[PDB]
Design a protein around this ligand. Sequence first.
Ligand SMILES: C[C@]12CCC(=O)C[C@@H]1CC[C@@H]1[C@@H]2CC[C@]2(C)[C@@H](O)CC[C@@H]12
Lengths: 251, 7
Amino acid sequence: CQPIFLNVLEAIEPGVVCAGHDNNQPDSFAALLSSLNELGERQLVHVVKWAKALPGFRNLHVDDQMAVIQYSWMGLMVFAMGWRSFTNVNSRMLYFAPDLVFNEYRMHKSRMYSQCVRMRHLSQEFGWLQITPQEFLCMKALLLFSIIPVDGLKNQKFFDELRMNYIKELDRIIACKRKNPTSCSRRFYQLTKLLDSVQPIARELHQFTFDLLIKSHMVSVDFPEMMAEIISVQVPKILSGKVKPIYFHTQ
Amino acid sequence: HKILHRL
Ligand SMILES: C[C@]12CCC(=O)C[C@@H]1CC[C@@H]1[C@@H]2CC[C@]2(C)[C@@H](O)CC[C@@H]12
């Protein structure tokens, strides 16, 4: 049998994205954060093209297509960055981009050291849990459907159905080489715990970038058009409790 | 402006 679903996920996976950072200059808070912001703007373009090509994405109402992207981009990008770090440098550093790799010194200079250490822990988990390339792809897609508004989406029903379908595909990938219910159950527990762990990290970064935007003119940090719009209009909805992640486990 | 536009 042909793995149609997985064939598609592999086929649409975005290529390499560079930040455009000048690594010839001594590190500074302003330059490092401005480059992270530009990388965010560039990655946002690839995330939109990727999402629009996902199986069933068009089943969603137009307004909800935009909403899920605007709310889950931070988690999606952090998860992908953690995987790149694992595969390219065995979690020795944070591989934001080929031209923007963070060692401990840069983590400190960025003023978000604690958050950076938590992301490195996430990267290490990909190795400790022996996450396969196929599990990574399915889990990343699921992250796009893991944060919603308390007030509900325009067509909450279509969303619930799509999310359920991606969960079913994850079950299938888990059952592939496993011919025992207990083994599958144990793996599902591990993967759902890993997925939940992304949310608290994304929340801390949401708070950090929000505060940075508010005082950006005082610290010389540049925010591109799309990033500035999303962080001033959508991010505060999550910080004020109007939009919340869907956790598998209670915590 | 025009939101993300390329949605
Ligand atoms: C999503 C990005 C950029 C894409 C990526 O690889 C993950 C990384 C996580 C930290 C984000 C950064 C984009 C710009 C932000 C939001 C800064 O303003 C502060 C936190 C940064």
